Structure 1
Amino acid sequence: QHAKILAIGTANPPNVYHQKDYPDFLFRVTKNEHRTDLREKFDRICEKSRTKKRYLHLTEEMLKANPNIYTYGAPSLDVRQDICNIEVPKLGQEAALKAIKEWGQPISRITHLIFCTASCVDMPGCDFQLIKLLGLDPSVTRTMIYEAGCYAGATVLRMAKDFAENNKGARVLVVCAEITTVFFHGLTDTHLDILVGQALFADGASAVIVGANPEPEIERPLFEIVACRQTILPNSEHGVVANIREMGFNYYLSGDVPKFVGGNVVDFMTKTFEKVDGKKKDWNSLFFSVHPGGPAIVDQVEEKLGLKEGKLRATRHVLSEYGNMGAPTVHFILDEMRNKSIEEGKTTTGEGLEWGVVIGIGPGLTVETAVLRSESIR
């Protein structure tokens, strides 16, 4: 009786930023049009990004009202927090209402709430704010995951699994929401990492309902969460770093991140599937939701696992249409996979396959995997 995903909902801010237009926007609104060297580099990064558009809360009017946000290193955490501590729970609410609708049960039936964000921090937290917005029972059992980073879309499934399986009848609402206003920085030739985040990072929220023992013909499972594993990739502490500072949430990204992922993927996949089956796996027999931290990460997974053409289509589709939204992204990918599987008349939510995996990748470097089974479409 494993925990099952019973619903997935998603949301994004309303403002669409097409990648073709973003270099012009960024350099204009941050008053850096004279930095033609930085512009050419940013153009090359955007060309390689495999991201066509992103949704962002941030607007030009907000930058005009708060120019410290684009003035590299200026004190600006307070204004960023004033925005994100409100907008993160609100975007989470939208996704949650969609998940709850799909699930089809009353909000009063939710017993547990997991809220995850790397975009803000406050006491009481986003979980408390979401309880107020949704009218959740005031005695819901909460887990508030602040500042974990991009592996957490897998981690929250692992946590939901344990809560759902160890508490008879529990129904866990899981909400991941990101608003990257807190991570927006201006341009300096001394901190080129910012060009990569400026090209890739995006806003979005996901919500998932998890429960064990779904009610036959009443709840409709989408995926089963079978087993999970979290690990730290050796010698990679510098891979992804983010610090909570007076200037906002500052970050550093090593160019070696993709190679670290590629150098460990066989191992972490093997060790994960050992928790289920003693037989060796054929990686092409699986469906995949891979956190698309950037396009090179996706390429490394494909290469080192020997994946066939098109195996990572759902992952690449989400990166293209939404960018890297952090923890929610792998949930967008599972939703996309389910929806494409319906479109194509596949027999299961996992592209017609039985077994699959979610791969979250973030600071440490830390990788969390969740082994899934699909469910029948009919």
Structure 2
Amino acid sequence: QHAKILAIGTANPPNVYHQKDYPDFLFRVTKNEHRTDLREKFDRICEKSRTKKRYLHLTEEMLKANPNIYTYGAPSLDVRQDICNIEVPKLGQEAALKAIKEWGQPISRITHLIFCTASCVDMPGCDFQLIKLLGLDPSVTRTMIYEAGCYAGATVLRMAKDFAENNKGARVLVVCAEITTVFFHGLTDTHLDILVGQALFADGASAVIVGANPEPEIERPLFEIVACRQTILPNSEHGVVVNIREMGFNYYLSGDVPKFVGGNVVDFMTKTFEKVDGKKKDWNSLFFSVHPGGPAIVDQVEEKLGLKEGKLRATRHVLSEYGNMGAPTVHFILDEMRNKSIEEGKTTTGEGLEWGVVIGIGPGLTVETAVLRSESIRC
């Protein structure tokens, strides 16, 4: 009896930033309107981003009050942490309450908590703060995953699987929450990576309830977590780097990340499915939740796996409507898949298909995959 996803909830900050307006906003609020050179490059990036809108906690008023946040390299970690250490658990709480509602059980049945964020760090951590906010049992068994990055949407499912399968009756609340205030940086032609993050990064939280042996008439599985694999792509340690510094969380993004993903996806998919049935081709038989680190990563997975038009629609839909929210994004994609599957009258939560995969991609470059089975659409 494998671990099942029993519920998914999601949440975002209330402020909507449409991409058509974000260049004007960013360059105005950071006092960079003279950098017409950088505005051209940012317009081009936004045009290619395949991101139509994003939800952000950050507001213009916060920047006016804390201009060090947009002053490249200036000390600002403390004010960023003061915000994010509060806002990340709060946004997580909202998602968790939605997941718990779907699940339909009392909060007292939660035995385990996984909290994941790359947006802040504190002791006690976000997990402790969420226990207070939700009134979880003080003896919940906790895993606090700080600063893992964009593969961790798959990683937390892998951890949840083992915790749920090895501890009979366990019910695991998994919460991934990101507030990108800590990553916001001003504009300099010495660090153009920032233009890419400014176009793509976004705020959001997911919550997933994981458990084996669903209770009949109460619990309803959405997906089954079958098998998982984590690997490091060769010769790519420069792909995604984040340093936690006095200036905030500083990041570097190699232009070659999409090529590394494309050059490795057939291998890492094949090695993942060796843990199941030895599948080695015909990837269109699967449903997919691909972490949309950027649009070129999505395009590379589609091209090198030979995916048909529309196979990655749910992934592209979330990237369009929410941007890259980090680890929660693959859970938004699973939720979107489930919702569209209901809308279309599909037989399962995975677009009618039986087997699928979650692909998380982050620093290392590290790829974690989770092979899923869908479930019938019921109650």
Identical residues among aligned pairs (%): 100
Query: Matched residues in 2 for 1:160 and 1:226: separation?
Result: 12
Residue number in structure 1 paired with 2:156: 156
Residue number in structure 2 paired with 1:23: 23
Deviation at 1:280, TM superposition (A): 3.4
Query: Matched residues in 2 for 1:282 and 1:98: separation?
Result: 36
Residue number in structure 1 paired with 2:176: 176
Structure 2 contact 10–207 (Cα < 8 Å) conserved = yes
Secondary structure in 2 matching 1:191: coil
Between 271-280 and 12-21, the greater mean CA deviation after superposition: 271-280
Structure 1 contact 110–140 (Cα < 8 Å) conserved = yes
Deviation at 1:205, TM superposition (A): 0.0
Query: Matched residues in 2 for 1:4 and 1:216: separation?
Result: 13
Post-superposition Cα deviations, 1:328-350, rounded to whole Å, max 9, x if no partner, equal 00000000000000000000000
Residue number in structure 2 paired with 1:109: 109
Secondary structure in 1 matching 2:296: helix
Structure 1 contact 349–376 (Cα < 8 Å) conserved = yes
Structure 1 contact 93–133 (Cα < 8 Å) conserved = yes
Question: TM-score, normalised on structure 1?
Answer: 1.00
Secondary structure in 1 matching 2:205: strand
Query: Matched residues in 2 for 1:278 and 1:328: separation?
Result: 29
Structure 1 contact 63–70 (Cα < 8 Å) conserved = yes
Residue number in structure 2 paired with 1:373: 373
Structure 2 contact 227–275 (Cα < 8 Å) conserved = yes
Query: Matched residues in 2 for 1:97 and 1:65: separation?
Result: 32
Deviation at 1:278, TM superposition (A): 3.1
Q: Would you say how many aligned residue pairs link Structure 1 and Structure 2? A: 378
Query: Matched residues in 2 for 1:213 and 1:301: separation?
Result: 34
Deviation at 1:49, TM superposition (A): 0.2
Residue number in structure 1 paired with 2:128: 128
Deviation at 1:279, TM superposition (A): 4.6
Between 273-282 and 131-140, the greater mean CA deviation after superposition: 273-282
Structure 1 contact 187–195 (Cα < 8 Å) conserved = yes
Post-superposition Cα deviations, 1:105-149, rounded to whole Å, max 9, x if no partner, equal 000000000000000000000000000000000000000000000
Post-superposition Cα deviations, 1:322-371, rounded to whole Å, max 9, x if no partner, equal 00000000000000000000000000000000000000000000000000
Secondary structure in 2 matching 1:202: coil
Secondary structure in 2 matching 1:85: helix
Query: Matched residues in 1 for 2:278 and 2:7: separation?
Result: 31
Structure 1 contact 273–281 (Cα < 8 Å) conserved = no
Query: Matched residues in 1 for 2:278 and 2:259: separation?
Result: 28
Query: Matched residues in 1 for 2:312 and 2:218: separation?
Result: 32
Gap change, CA 1:169 and 1:53, over 3 Å in 2: same
Query: Matched residues in 1 for 2:230 and 2:166: separation?
Result: 20
Deviation at 1:40, TM superposition (A): 0.2
Post-superposition Cα deviations, 1:13-59, rounded to whole Å, max 9, x if no partner, equal 00000000000000000000000000000000000000000000000
Deviation at 1:283, TM superposition (A): 0.2
Secondary structure in 2 matching 1:176: strand
Structure 1 contact 258–296 (Cα < 8 Å) conserved = yes
Query: Matched residues in 1 for 2:119 and 2:349: separation?
Result: 31
Query: Matched residues in 1 for 2:309 and 2:63: separation?
Result: 42
Structure 1's consecutive aligned runs of 4 or more residues displaced over 4 angstroms after TM superposition are: none
Deviation at 1:281, TM superposition (A): 4.2
Deviation at 1:217, TM superposition (A): 2.2
Query: Matched residues in 1 for 2:285 and 2:200: separation?
Result: 30
Secondary structure in 2 matching 1:271: helix
Query: Matched residues in 2 for 1:298 and 1:331: separation?
Result: 16
Query: Matched residues in 2 for 1:279 and 1:125: separation?
Result: 41
Secondary structure in 1 matching 2:96: helix
Deviation at 1:216, TM superposition (A): 1.8
Secondary structure in 1 matching 2:51: coil
Between 271-280 and 129-138, the greater mean CA deviation after superposition: 271-280
Residue number in structure 1 paired with 2:11: 11
Secondary structure in 2 matching 1:79: helix
Residue number in structure 2 paired with 1:240: 240
Post-superposition Cα deviations, 1:182-201, rounded to whole Å, max 9, x if no partner, equal 00000001000000000000
Post-superposition Cα deviations, 1:36-92, rounded to whole Å, max 9, x if no partner, equal 000000000000000000000000000000000000000000000000000000000
Query: Matched residues in 2 for 1:299 and 1:279: separation?
Result: 22
Query: Matched residues in 2 for 1:299 and 1:271: separation?
Result: 21
Query: Matched residues in 2 for 1:364 and 1:63: separation?
Result: 32
Structure 2 contact 6–220 (Cα < 8 Å) conserved = yes
Query: Matched residues in 2 for 1:331 and 1:281: separation?
Result: 25
Structure 1 contact 72–188 (Cα < 8 Å) conserved = yes
Query: Matched residues in 1 for 2:212 and 2:287: separation?
Result: 22
RMSD between superposed Cα atoms in Å: 0.5
Secondary structure in 1 matching 2:376: coil
Deviation at 1:215, TM superposition (A): 1.0
Query: Matched residues in 2 for 1:195 and 1:278: separation?
Result: 41
Structure 2 contact 270–278 (Cα < 8 Å) conserved = no
Deviation at 1:218, TM superposition (A): 1.6
Structure 2 contact 178–203 (Cα < 8 Å) conserved = yes
Secondary structure in 1 matching 2:176: strand
